[PDB]
Each structure stands twice: as C-alpha cells, then as structure tokens.
Amino acid sequence: QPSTANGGFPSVVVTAVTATTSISPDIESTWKGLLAGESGIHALEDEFVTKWDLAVKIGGHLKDPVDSHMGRLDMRRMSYVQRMGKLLGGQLWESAGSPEVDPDRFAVVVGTGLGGAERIVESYDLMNAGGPRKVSPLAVQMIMPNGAAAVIGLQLGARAGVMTPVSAQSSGSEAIAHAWRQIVMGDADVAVCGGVEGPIEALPIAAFSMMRAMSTRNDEPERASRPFDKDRDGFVFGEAGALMLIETEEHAKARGAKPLARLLGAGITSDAFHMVAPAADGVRAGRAMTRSLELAGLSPADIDHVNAHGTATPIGDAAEANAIRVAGCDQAAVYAPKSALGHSIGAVGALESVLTVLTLRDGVIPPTLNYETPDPEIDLDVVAGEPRYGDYRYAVNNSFGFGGHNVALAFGRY
Template structure:
C-alpha cells in the first residue's frame, strides 16, 4: 500500500485545566493556571521542599464507574478517559474500522509506579493475601496502551513507547509511521501520566529541577522568564485519532489538521541535561520538515517543550533558530499545565492542532521579564490570532530523546 497523508480526526484530554479538550483549550486562552498547593499528608510528613503540583481538574473517579476505576492504575484511568473522548470526537460508533486495521500507540514516562508502591506497602504490612492479583497489569508501562487496545479491539498492533517526557509525542510519531507504511488505517495515539507521589516529588526535588515557589503556585511555572526556577509536576492524558487521509475522507470525517511530518533523534550527551548546542533538537525539527516536504519559511509557530528550567529553555530556542530561523512565534503550555511528563507531548500536540484549527496561539503565562538569551517572538499576556500553515510541536525527554511533530492546516 502506498504512503498516505495522515490526518487528525479526534481529540481527547483530561488535564489540570479541565476534564476535556474544550475546557483545557478555553483555560489556556483565558490564562488560567492548573497549578495549586498539594494537600497530601506526605508533603508535610517528608518535609518536601516542593509543595505544589498541577493536579487533574476532574478526578478520574468522577468519570469512571467505581468497579472499573478500582481495576486500573491512575495512568490507565486517564488514558481510557481521553481515548473515549477522542474516539467519540472522531465520529466512530461501535464500528467503522476493521479491528485488524486499527492500531494503538500510547506512551508513558513512568507508568504505574503508584500501584507498585501501594501494593508493596500492602505486602509489607499485611502479607501476601492483601496483594491484588491485578498488580502487574496495573503497574506495567504498557497498561494504558493495552487497555485502550482492549476497549476498541485494536489488532493492527498495540505499542507503548517509553521515552520519558517525549513519550506522548513518540506515540504520535510511531502512529504516523504505521499509517504511512499502510499497516493501519486508523491509530489511537498519545500519552498518559499520573504519578504525583512522594517518591517522584522527592526525586525531582533532590535533583533540583522543580520550582519551589510554594507561596505562588499559579506563578511557579514560568518558561523563559529570568526568574524561572524549575518545572511543576503535573498529571493527565492526551489522545488523538489519526487516520490515513483517504480512509477519513471516505467516511466523511471532520479533519482538524494534518500530521505532515515527524522527526526523532537523540542527543547521546547526558542522562538528564540537553546538549547545550541544541544540535540534535534542531535535527529532529529538520527531519520533521524534511519528511513532510515542508519549507522552514512556512513554519509560523513552534509549540515549545520549554519546561521552565534554566538550561533547557534557552537551548530549545537556539535549536529553533538553527532548524527553522528567527520567524516562528513561540508559546509554552507548561506555564499553565505544569509538566505532564509522558503525557506532555500528546496534550501539547492537541494544543498545537487547535492553534492551527482556530487560527489562534495561546499565551505563555508568567513571563514578567524575558530571558535575554531568548531572541525569538514569544506570545505572552493575550492569545494571538494568526493564520497558520504549519506549526511544530517539540518534545524532549531525559535520556536525550528529541521528538518534533509538524502539523499543517487541513
């Protein structure tokens, strides 16, 4: 089967800004923050220096039936919620695509660590009989992808890329490859993460990568601002339905945008720090444009990974200038969402898709004074209306993973 254009027909999300895509998008445009003070007892018990996080606006237990929720890790819960939204948004009912032509690629950075910790506590305190027989299916990193595959009877392959904070974007990239190769007609793709827990908070705090602006939670995540002091941990899921264009057109599907090209590289530089030259981040963007036949001059917008760390934020802008030039307009969703780790690249791809679809770029919050090392146009304060032909979403992860996704107008 010959290569095909890949189109986006369905969107689903549950995030710190809302329980769905529309609420999340509206929250961005309104400049709301999803970051708040943590009230869990372990914050004080362990005297954590970081006492804030970007928690879900709508708890999964408010959406899922009680029995179903109890059988799923929180990362699996959010993945299913977002997948069901995306499938419905794409206009599929109980049928519409043969199972052997439907695939799933949903990544996660950490997976079911909270299940692992909880079940280990039960084992230590109460013995073997209290450990759930569902422990392994709940803790395995492929759990979110597997449950979505079961839900929709996907038999063209169910995959779970694990590449830290680039996992969700890799989900879309590998889905694009499945569709381009003709191995599937439809792929449910994205990422999920829900691991706001004592051990993750403590680990990130010890590495001094998280903001300690505890007295101003909503102002803590501040990409590119001179006073940024680290990221804010978040949770959520983003799922998109991708289709071969001819398949989508044949069934009369609404198309949000095209996933025109993808690029994936690795820094091979350091386990957590990016290559300060931004060379391989730039090459990922170049690969995305090359695979989509895109002229860099056509790229009007970059939805940046920008986590609010001192080194990473500026390095990315260096990479953008290398790969594309000085003309793209930038925004950073983590200023409102926090950092959703394995879900970040998927949720931020949805924001990129909607920016193209609606012709408006959401603002970056909390930029009081732009870092002088950032010599690019950053949208702040108010949304900016802009007709976009092409926009790129960047996602990078510990381990040196770089993923760039190039979206174009429908």
C-alpha cells in the same frame, strides 16, 4: 525521496482530540481558558505536603479527577494510568462519532513515563506484611508499562498493533510519531495515540526535587512556571492525559469525519550527551525538527508556529532556543504551554500536540504566562500578554526527555 508534500506518504489527518488537564476535563474549555490567560497551577492542599514538609508546595491537580468516573471494579483491577487511559479512550471514540472501523487496520500507540508504579509499591507492602499469596493475580498486568495502551486497545478493538514507546518526558509526542509511521508504512489506516501519566504524589515530588529541577515559588503558585523568562526557577507539575485520533485522509473522507489538522511528519533523534541535561548546543534536538520538515516536505521558513517543550528550567529552555535556531525556525511564533498547564511528564507531549492542532484549527496561539523579562540567550518570538492571531498554516510541536530523546511533530492546517 518520499515526503507528504510529494505524495510519497499518504495524507494523514487528525480527526478527534480529547484531554484532561488542571484547567478542565473538556479540551475545548481548557483551550478557552488558556486563551483567556488562565493557569491550572495552585497551592497543593494534599496532606502529603504537610506530612513530609515538601520544599515544593505547588502544582495543578486535574480539575476533574479520573477516579470520579471509575466504578468499583475498575478501581480494583487497573492502575491509575490504565483508568485514565480507559476514560480518555472512551471520550475520544465518542467525540469521533463512535466509528465502526476495520479492527485489523486500527492501531493504538500510547506513551507513559513509568506505568502502574503504585501497584508495585502496593504489591511490595502486601507481600512484606502477609506473604506471596497476598499479591493480586492482576498485579503484573496493572504494573506493566504497556498496560494503559493495552487497556485502550482492548476497549476500542485495535488489532493492527498496540505500542508503548517510553522516552520519559517525550513519550506522549513519540507515541504520536510512531502512530504516524505505522500509518504511512501501511500497517494501519487509523490510530489512537497520545500519552497518560500518574497524578502528583509525594514520592515523584521528592525524586525530581533532589535533582534541583523544580520551582519552589510557593507564595505565588500561578507565577511559578516561567518558561523562557529571565526569572525562571524550574518546572511545575501539572497533571494531564491526552489522546488524538489520526487516520488517512481517504479513511476520514469515506466516513464523513471533519479533520482538525494534518499530521505531516515526525523526527526522532538523540543527544548522546548527558542522561538528564539536554546538549546546550541544541544540534540533535534541532535535527529532530529538521527531519520532521524533510518528511513533511516543508522548509523552515514555512513554519509559522513552534509549540515549545519549554519546561522553565534555566538549562532546558536555553538548549531548546538553540535547537530552534539550528532548525531555522526561530522566526516562528513560540508558545510554552507549561507556563499555564505545568509538566505532565509522559503525557505532556501528547497534550501539547493537541494544543498545536487547536492553534492551527482556530488561528490563534495563547499567551505564554509569566513571560515578563526576556532573557537575551533566548532570542525567540515568545507569544505573551494576549493571544496572537494569524493564519498559521504549519507548526512544529517539540518534546524532549531524560535519556537525551528529541521528538518533533510537524502539523499543518487542514
């Protein structure tokens, strides 16, 4: 029975990470902010909020907007998730030391929730106003949801496959799972993986608001996202994109890269319960966690830390507490980063996987913000108030998505 622990799968390490967030464009600065209790969530100052008088008037825009780094041709030839992909792909490579790798052993797996959807609406308006010849010859390649992964693949020269798993809010973690499978199956030795997502805009706010999923605590934006708290009232948008570089331990050693963590195993399951509510019992979600432990070669008692999906809906957080119990991981120290960074949909599982790596690298879990009144249906060890220090040696990052998708990633200290 192959596991990582028993040498049945090659050892896979994380050797570089990059992310842009509502706190900082610099992941090390985001991480210092989080440990200091900073939130990226503010009053939205966009004119679209007053134009439409939106019920939701809070969110975290990126600290450093993607397009301040894009030249004239990038703005007219890529959709926004493609520009974010290019920006992060170059940062990651530079952070990695700009390695010269074998392109034929180099894969890219990048998830996103939707793709270049603004170009859909642009092409629709252009054609309605001026006919079919007003549609750009670039529209197809900007719009297609594999667009961002493909821009990264072209940019960095990856020829062992470029893949885009889409599973709504779990896409960013699912991508890192498929990258790990591609390596252990022997299709690649090195992979860039993670997730990108669009910015906060009026139409996405309108659509999730009609699901009654979003916090409307507009008077205290930094207090609004309260995962696992008794007084939680839904999620808050917080923009992000994140990528990491993973490679076999052999490949990293040959080029002198210092690992940040190990990526030990991944589990994907599905609920077959409901399209937009997680099964309350957490059973299939718990089993995604268990399967990541089986592939890693770990037991539940090994898991020191869980990085919760923790969206701060009443229903979502209760199902996830039940899933953590099913997996036997409810004595782990838990963090819910959406408390501070909000929800970035297709990117967020990637961002939170990067945070999980940093917890293992640095031996610390940031405080979950706004965690003030424990909820008795949630009987979890939620880290709050101040950071929790410790010699953490194994952690699980959870992500789930509309459609019933459950993804868990098992990481270890290097």
